[PDB]
Amino acid sequence: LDFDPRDVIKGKDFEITAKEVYDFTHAVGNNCEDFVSRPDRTMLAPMDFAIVVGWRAIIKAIFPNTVDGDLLKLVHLSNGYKMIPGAKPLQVGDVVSTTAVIESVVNQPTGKIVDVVGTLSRNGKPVMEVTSSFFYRGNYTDFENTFQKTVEPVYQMHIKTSKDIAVLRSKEWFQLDDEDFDLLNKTLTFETETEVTFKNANIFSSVKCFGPIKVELPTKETVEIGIVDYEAGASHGNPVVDFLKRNGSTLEQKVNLENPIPIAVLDSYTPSTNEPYARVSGDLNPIHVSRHFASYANLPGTITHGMFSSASVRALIENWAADSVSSRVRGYTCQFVDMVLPNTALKTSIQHVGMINGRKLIKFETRNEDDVVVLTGEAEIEQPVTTFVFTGQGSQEQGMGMDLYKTSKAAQDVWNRADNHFKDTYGFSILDIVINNPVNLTIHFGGEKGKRIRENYSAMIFETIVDGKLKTEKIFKEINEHSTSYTFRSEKGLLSATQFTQPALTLMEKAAFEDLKSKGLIPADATFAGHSLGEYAALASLADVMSIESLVEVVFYRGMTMQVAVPRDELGRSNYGMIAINPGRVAASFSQEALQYVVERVGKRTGWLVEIVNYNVENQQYVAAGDLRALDTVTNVLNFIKLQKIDIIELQKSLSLEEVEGHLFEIIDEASKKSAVKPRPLKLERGFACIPLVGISVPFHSTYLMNGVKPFKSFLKKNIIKENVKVARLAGKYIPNLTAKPFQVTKEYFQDVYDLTGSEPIKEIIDNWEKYEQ
Amino acid sequence: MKPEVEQELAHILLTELLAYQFASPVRWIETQDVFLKDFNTERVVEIGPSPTLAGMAQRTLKNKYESYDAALSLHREILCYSKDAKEIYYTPDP
Amino acid sequence: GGQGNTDDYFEELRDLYQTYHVLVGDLIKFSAETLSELIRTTLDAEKVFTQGLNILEWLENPSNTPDKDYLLSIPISCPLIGVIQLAHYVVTAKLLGFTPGELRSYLKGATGHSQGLVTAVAIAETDSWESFFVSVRKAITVLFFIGVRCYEAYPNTSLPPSILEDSLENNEGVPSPMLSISNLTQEQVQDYVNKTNSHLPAGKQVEISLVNGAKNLVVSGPPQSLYGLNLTLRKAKAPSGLDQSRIPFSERKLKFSNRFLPVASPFHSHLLVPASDLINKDLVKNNVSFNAKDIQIPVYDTFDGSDLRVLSGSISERIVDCIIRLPVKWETTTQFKATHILDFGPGGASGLGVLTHRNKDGTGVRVIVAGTLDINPDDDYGFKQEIFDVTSNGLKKNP
Amino acid sequence: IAKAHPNFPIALQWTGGRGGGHHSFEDAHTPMLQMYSKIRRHPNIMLIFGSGFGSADDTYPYLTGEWSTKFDYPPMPFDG
C-alpha cells in the first residue's frame, strides 16, 4: 500500500478473445447483433469492455496507505468512457496496454472522494479514456495527502479596447512568447488546467494554473501564443479564472437543442444474481453476490453491479439512438445515484438534448419500479456518415440568407466582415445588393479612400496564356488615374452578374455553415464539395483554408476573369452561353457517347465553340457551353432528332461506326444553317431536350478558358497561405470537381490531374517527388 | 510523412486544382457516385439558397442506386438548407 | 409439421398437460428430464438457456413461462414441437388401443416439414409403448442439439428499430430470419435474389429455403437482407385494393402479400452449414443412430422426395443437411399417392395440412387436423373427431 | 346464390374478354383455375366455358381437365 497516489499505475497487457466478449454480452444484455458473427473473424468489442481490463489497475490507486478508507461503505458514484477522436473501436485481435492515474482526491465532510482516469492504447496509440468517481464516505482530516486537479471551461476573451491588454500585461501569469503581439480586435481562448493541494476544505495550500493561450485568426483557426503559469499558496480561490469569468466568457462547445425530443421510454430487467458479471469483469465484490457483507454494509442485500446497469443501458441505447451500430458511440457517461436489487425492472428514459462537435447529445434516466431514479448521464453519439454539398452559380435570389442574417450572430459576423471589407477596398456592400437587386451600380472615387479604391480596381490584371505570355492585361480599361468613378450594368440586376453572384453565394453558404458550427452539427470526418462555385465556400467552411476576405477577393477576381475573356455588346451581352441536356428525353437509349457524337460534329463543322462542361447525372444531365450560334444549333438538331427519334445509338449499331460520320455530318451541317441564321441577339429555348441558362453568358469550364488560369493561379498563390491550410481536413473528405476522386497527396493523384491538364508543377514534383524522402 | 513538406505540397495541389478548375469540365457524375457509394453516406446536405443538387440527388440515387440502397437497408436522406431546417437542426415539433 | 406456422406453439401444449394429463404426463416428464440431463451432461448449453429449460413448472403456472424471444427460439422450441407432435400421435394410438408399431403398420408412409421429419422417422422404429421412449429420446436429442449448434452458429441480434417501425406501416411485422411470399413463382423471386445478392456478399446472401407451394415460397437470410428484399419488392407492389378491373390482364402489376414468420433462425441456408458436422458428433457422442431395417414405413426426403431406407450411409446426416442447408420441394416429396392426410404438426388451423390441401385439392385427397378439435364449415378438410368416428360420417371424402 | 338456393340449377357460362361482343379484361383461365374448387362445392352449378372455340380439338382438354395440367394444376374438366 505504498503506492504513490500521485504517480501513475501500470496495468498489464491484455489480449482480447471472442470468447470473453460472448461471455460478457450475455452476462449483460447487449444483444446488439453486431458485436458477434461467425467466429474466426475480427469481431468488434464494446466500449464498456474496457473496464474489464482497466480494473486491475484502475483501483491500485485507492489501495495505498496514504489514501485511507473502508472499502465497505465505499461507493461508485459515476463512470464515463470517451473514445478519443480518430481512434477506432476495439476488436478481438487487438491486444491492449492500459494505464491509470488518479486525477483528484478530495476530502469532503461527508467522507472522501476519488476521481481516477485511465487511458488505453493499442500498438502504443491511445484508444480511449475512462473517468471514474468513487467515494470513501465517512470523515477524514488527512488534507496533507489530499489534492485536486481539473480542466477548466475554455474561456473566451474578446478584445476591443486597449486598457484591457494592459491590465493583462499588468499580469504575471499572462506571459507570452513575444509581448510585441497586437491584441486589438483579437479573440483569445484559454484552455487552462488547474492543480491544487489543499490543507482545508476551502483554504488551499498550493495552486498551479497552467495552460496555453490561443488566438483567433481571420480563419478563426486558433493558434498558440503564450502560456499561463500561476503559482500560489494559502489561496482561497482561483484568480486566473475569475479574471476570465467577468472579463471573458465560457466557450461552451456544447449547445442545447431548441425543443427537446424524446427517443424512447424503455424497460429492462436486472439479473437474478450477480455472479456471471463478477466472473467476467473480475469484480469479485461480495457486495453483489454474497449476503454476509451487504448486511455488514447496512444494505438491502446482494445488489446488482452498478456497472452492469451502465452497460445494460448503453446497449439499450446503441440499438435505439445509433440504430445498432457501435462505432458511432464515442462518449458515454453515467452517474450512479442510489442502489438496486436483482430481478428489478426499470423505466429508462431517453432524450435528445444537445449537440457537440457535430455529434449528438443524449440524456438518460432510469426510473425504478417505484419510479425513482437510479442512473442519469449522457452519451456522445456520432451522426450518420454525413455529407455537405455546396451549390454553384444559378441558385441566387433576393433576400437570400438575409432572413438569417437577422438571426445567427455567427452569420452576420460574416456578412459584415465581408461587406465592411469591400466598402473599404472596392466600395460596395452586398447587404444593399441582395436585398434590392439594382440594374446599375456606380462607384465614386472620392478623396483618399476613393483613390485607394480606384487603384484597387486598376491594380488588377487579366494575365492570359498567349505565346506563353503571362499577358499583363488590364482588367478595367475605362479606369485610369484621371477617372473618378465607374459603372457596372446588368439589365435585369447585378445579382444576375457572375461579377457579384459568386461572392454572395459563397457568403450565404459559409454563413449557414458557420451557424451550424455554432450549433455543433459538423463532424471532423464529414465530407464536403461544391458544384463549380461551392468549392471555395467548402474549403473555408470545413478546412478554413483562408479568411473570408481573401476568399471573396479571389471569387470576385474569378467572376471578372470569367467575364472578360469574351467581348460583349452594349450592356454586357455576348455571343457565348451554355445549355443543359437530358439524353433521356431525346431517347432513353441516348448514351453518354451520344452527346459526344452529336456535339463534336457541330464543333468541328461550324468551327464554333460547344463542349460538355459538366457531367452532372449520366444519361440524364450534361451541360455544355460555347458559341450560342452553335449551341442553339445543337439544340435544334436534338429537337429535330427526337421528333424523329433517330437513335444515334441505333446509328452506331445499325451503321458501321464511320458511315455514321457522314450521316451525322449531313444531318448537322444541314441543321446548323437551318438554325445558324439567327440574329446576333440570339435567344435560347427549351425545345425537346435542352434548357437555356440565363443569367449565364460565359462558357466556363471548357478549354476556351485554359488561358485564364495563370492570372488566377498566381492571384491564388498570393491570397492563400500554405500555413492556414491543414491537410487533416482534406484527405478523403474533399473531392475536387476537377478530380472527382477524394483529395489525396500521391503521385497517382498528381498524374490523374496532370495527364488531363498537362501542367508543369505535377511533372516537376513527381520528378522531384523524393523530397518526400526527408 | 513530414507534416510540413506535405503541408506545402498540399497547398500547391490545392492551388493548381482550383486554378484549372476553370476549364476542365466538372466530374460531378464521378463524385455523386463515389461519395454516395464508396462511403455510403446517409445524410447529404445541399447548402445553398435553392435545392438543386437535391434534384441532382434522388435522381441519380434512384436511377442507379436503388437495388444497391435497398440491398443494405439505407435510409439515405437528402436535405436542403432552404426547406429542411428542422430535419437538419433536429428541431421538429410533433 | 415443422417450424414457422404459428406464434404461440407453447400454448398448444396446454391442452396436452391440461386435457390429456393422465395420458401424456409420464411422457412429458421423461422428455423434460432427459432434456435437462442433456443440458447438464453437455458442456456449455447452460448459457444459451438463460432462464433455463425447467418446462414442467412452466405449465402449471404460465407466469413461470418466459416469453418468445427466449421461448420462440430454436434450442428451446424445436424439441417442444417434436414432442407436441409425438403427443398428438400417442393420444390417438392409445385411443385406438394401437401401439406405435400397430399404428405405423397402417400407413403407407410418412414425412415431415423443416424439422418434423425426424419425428416421422422416429415413429418408423416404434413398436411398443415401452420401446417408445427410446425413440422419443433419439429424436428429442436431435432437436436439442440442432437448435443449439444452430443458435450459436447464427444467433439472434436485436434489430435497429429504424426498420422495425417502418415495416409496421409497411403492412409487415417484426423481421425474422425467414420470409414468406405469396402469389409469386420460384423464378421471379430467384431473379430478385440474384439481384439483391449481386449488391451483397455471401455472409449476408439469401436463398430460397422452402418451395412450400408453387406460388407460396419462403426464403431465408439475415433480417437485414430480407428487409432489403422486402423493399425491392415494395417497388413492385400493387395494393390489393387497387382495383385493376379496368386494365387488361397482361398490363397489370403483380400484387401479392408477404411477411415474416415467427422464427428465430434461418433454416435451409448456407449460414448454418458449419454446425452440421458439429452435431453428427454430438449424436455419436450419444448412441443415437437411425437404420433402414428399423423403419418399416417409408419416409421421404423434403429435398428429393425419395425414401430413406434406400440411402448410401447414415440417415441423420441427410436429415440435418435437409433441415439446415437444403430447401424443401414440398411437392417433389408429396409426389406420393394417398386419399387421406393428417398433420400432428403444430398450427393446425394454420398448420401445414392446410396449405397441403391448397395444393392437394383437385387431386382427390382429404386432409384433417389431428391436433385440434374444431369445425370447418366447408369441410374441405377435417379435424381430430373425423379420425375417431366409427361411422360413415368419419370417412368423409372430398372429390 | 347457389348456397341460397341449393336445388335450383345454375349455369355459369364463364367466358373471357377474348370473346366477341362485350369484352372483359380478365383472362379466360386464371379465375377458373383458382375458383373451380369453390364452385364444385355446390352441385347446382353447371359449368360452361366459351371465348374462343370453333371445333372439338380446341376444347376437348377443357372437357377433360387436361388444360389445368400445363398450369401445374389438377385436371379440371368442364360441364359444357
Residue numbers in the entry:
A (entry chain G): 1277 to 2050
B (entry chain A): 1 to 94
C (entry chain G): 161 to 559
D (entry chain G): 719 to 798
Recite the paper's sentences:
Type I fungal FAS forms a barrel-shaped complex composed of two reaction chambers. Six β-chains form the walls of the barrel while a central wheel, made by the six α-chains, bisects the barrel into two chemically identical reaction chambers. Therefore, each chamber has three complete sets of catalytic domains including three acyl-carrier protein (ACP) domains. Substrates are shuttled between the static reaction centers by the mobile ACP domain flexibly tethered at its N and C termini.
We used cryoEM to reconstruct ab initio ACP densities inside the reaction chambers of endogenous fungal FASs from S. cerevisiae and the opportunistic pathogen Candida albicans in the Apo and KS-stalled state, at 12 Å resolution, allowing localization of densities corresponding to this mobile domain. In the Apo state, ACP density is strongest in proximity of the KS domain in S. cerevisiae FAS and allows for a complete tracing of its backbone atoms in the high resolution cryoEM map. Examining the surface electrostatics of ACP- KS- and ER-domains shows a strong surface charge complementarity between the structural lobe of ACP with the KS domain in S. cerevisiae. In S. cerevisiae FAS, second strongest ACP density is observed at lower resolution and less stringent threshold of the AAI map that shows ACP near the apical region of the reaction chamber and facing the AT catalytic site. In both FASs in the Apo state, the structural lobe of ACP has stronger and better resolved densities compared to the canonical lobe in the KS-binding site, as observed in the high-resolution refined maps, suggesting a more stable interaction between the former and the KS-domain in the absence of substrates. Interestingly, in the S. cerevisiae Apo and KS-stalled states, where no ACP density can be seen by the ER domain, the catalytic histidine side chain is in a single conformation facing FMN.
